[PDB]
Amino acid sequence: APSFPFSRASGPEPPAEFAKLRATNPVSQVKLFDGSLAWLVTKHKDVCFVATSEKLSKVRTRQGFPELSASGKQAAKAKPTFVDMDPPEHMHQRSMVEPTFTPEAVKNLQPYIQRTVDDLLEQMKQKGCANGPVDLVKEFALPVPSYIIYTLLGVPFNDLEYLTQQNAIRTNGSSTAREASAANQELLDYLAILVEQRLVEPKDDIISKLCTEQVKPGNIDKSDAVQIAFLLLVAGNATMVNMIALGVATLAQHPDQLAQLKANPSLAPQFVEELCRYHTASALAIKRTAKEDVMIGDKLVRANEGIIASNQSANRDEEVFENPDEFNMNRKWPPQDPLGFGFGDHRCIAEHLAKAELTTVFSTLYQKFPDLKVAVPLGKINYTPLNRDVGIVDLPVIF
Numbered sequence: 001a002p003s004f005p006f007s008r009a010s011g012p013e014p015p016a017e018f019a020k021l022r023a024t025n026p027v028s029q030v031k032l033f034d035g036s037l038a039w040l041v042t043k044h045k046d047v048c049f050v051a052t053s054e055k056l057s058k059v060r061t062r063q064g065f066p067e068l069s070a071s072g073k074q075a076a077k078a079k080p081t082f083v084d085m086d087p088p089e090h091m092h093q094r095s096m097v098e099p100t101f102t103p104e105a106v107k108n109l110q111p112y113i114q115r116t117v118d119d120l121l122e123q124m125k126q127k128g129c130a131n132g133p134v135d136l137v138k139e140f141a142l143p144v145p146s147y148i149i150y151t152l153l154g155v156p157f158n159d160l161e162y163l164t165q166q167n168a169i170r171t172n173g174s175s176t177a178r179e180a181s182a183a184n185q186e187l188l189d190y191l192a193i194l195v196e197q198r199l200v201e202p203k204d205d206i207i208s209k210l211c212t213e214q215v216k217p218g219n220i221d222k223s224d225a226v227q228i229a230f231l232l233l234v235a236g237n238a239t240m241v242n243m244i245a246l247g248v249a250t251l252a253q254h255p256d257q258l259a260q261l262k263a264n265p266s267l268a269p270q271f272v273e274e275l276c277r278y279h280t281a282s283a284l285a286i287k288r289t290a291k292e293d294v295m296i297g298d299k300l301v302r303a304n305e306g307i308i309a310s311n312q313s314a315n316r317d318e319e320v321f322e323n324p325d326e327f328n329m330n331r332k333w334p335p336q337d338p339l340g341f342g343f344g345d346h347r348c349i350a351e352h353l354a355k356a357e358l359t360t361v362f363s364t365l366y367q368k369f370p371d372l373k374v375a376v377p378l379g380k381i382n383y384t385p386l387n388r389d390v391g392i393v394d395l396p397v398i399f
C-alpha cells in the first residue's frame with residue numbers, strides 16, 4: 001500500500017496517482033504516517049457517498065480515525081467543536097454560528113466585502129511598484145480574507161494587521177514549531193480576552209452572538225466560544241489566501257481567459273466556480289471512520305477502518321466533468337456539484353462567503369490593475385511544498 005498523502009505531480013497539479021486509481025482501483029488502501037492502513041476513495045460518486053453515509057463518523061476518538069500527521073493525533077485529544085462532530089451534536093453547535101454565513105447574510109455583507117477589496121487594492125496602488133515587484137500575497141491575498149473574518153468575529157480595526165501577521169506565521173512553511181505555536185497561543189489568548197469583553201458589553205459580531213445567545217444561557221461556556229471562534233478563523237483563512245493567489249497565477253497561464261475576464265468582469269462567478277473545481281486547495285478534510293461494515297464500490301470497509309475521500313480527485317473525475325484537466329471557465333456544468341467545499345452535512349459553512357470574496361476579487365482586480373502581470377517566469381512560481389495542499393507562498397507582481 002502506497003504512503004499517503006501523495007505528493008503533487010508538479011507545482012500546480014494534483015497527485016498523479018489519482019488519475020490512475022480512478023481508472024483501475026477507485027477504492028484502495030493507503031498507508032498512513034503511523035503505519036496504519038486507510039481506504040482512499042477517488043471517484044465523485046463515492047466521495048459523495050462517504051460524505052453523506054450515516055454509517056461513517058467524524059468523531060476523532062473513534063478507533064481507526066485516519067490522522068495524517070502526529071500533530072493531528074494529539075489535536076484529537078482536545079474537546080471537539082462541530083467540525084469533528086456527528087449528528088445530532090454537529091448541527092446543534094453549527095447552527096449557533098450558521099446565521100452569519102447564509103446566502104442572505106452574505107448578500108448583505110457584499111458592500112463591506114467590496115469596500116475591503118477596494119481599500120486594499122487602493123493601498124497597493126499607492127504603495128506602487130516603482131522599486132521592484134510587490135508580493136500580491138502579502139499585499140492583498142492575505143489581508144482580504146483575514147480582515148473580513150476578523151471583522152466578522154469582532155476584532156477592532158486597529159488590531160487587524162498584527163493578528164493577520166500572527167495567523168500567517170501559524171501556517172508559514174518556514175516557521176519553526178516554536179514560532180508557529182507561539183503565534184497560535186497569541187491568537188487563542190486574544191480571542192479569550194475578546195470573549196470576556198463581549199460577555200460584558202456585546203456588540204454586533206459573531207463572538208457577541210455566541211456570548212449572548214449561548215454562553216450566558218449556559219448552552220456552552222466561554223472556553224467553547226473561544227474554540228468556535230478559533231475554528232472559524234483558522235479553518236479557511238490560509239485556503240482563501242491560496243485561492244486568490246492561485247486564481248491570479250491560473251489567469252497568467254491562460255491568457256485567452258484573462259482577456260475574456262478583462263472585457264467582461266461579469267464572468268467572475270464562472271471563473272470562480274472553475275477555479276474551485278480545478279484547484280482543490282483543501283483536499284484532505286473529508287475523513288471518516290466506519291461505525292459499521294460498509295460497502296463502497298467493490299470493497300468492503302470494515303467497522304473501525306478509516307476512509308479518506310479525495311474531493312480533489314473527484315473534481316477531476318472524467319465520468320462527471322468532461323476534459324477535467326483543462327481549465328475552462330466557459331465549461332458547461334453537469335448536474336453534479338463540484339466538491340471544492342465538500343458535501344453533505346459538513347459542507348463548508350463559509351461556501352457562500354468564500355465565493356463572494358473570490359467573485360469580488362476577480363471582478364475588481366483587473367479593472368483596478370488592467371496591466372497586472374506576474375513578475376517572475378510562470379515556471380518559477382513559488383508553490384507550496386508538493387506534500388501539502390496546493391497553494392502559492394508568494395507571488396511577485398508588477399502593474
Ligand code: HEM
Nearest residue numbers: 083232235236282285340341342343346347348349350354
Ligand atoms: C475557498 C475557500 C474555502 C474552501 C475551498 C473551503 C473548503 C472546505 C472543505 C473542503 C471543507 C470540508 C467540508 C466537508 O467535510 O464536507 C470545509 C469545511 C469547513 N470550512 Fe471551509 N473552505 C473555504 C473557506 C472557509 C472559510 C472562509 C471559513 C470560515 C469563515 C471556513 C470554515 C469551514 C468550517 C467551519 C468547516 C467545517 C464545516 C462542518 O464540519 O460543519 N472555510 N471547507
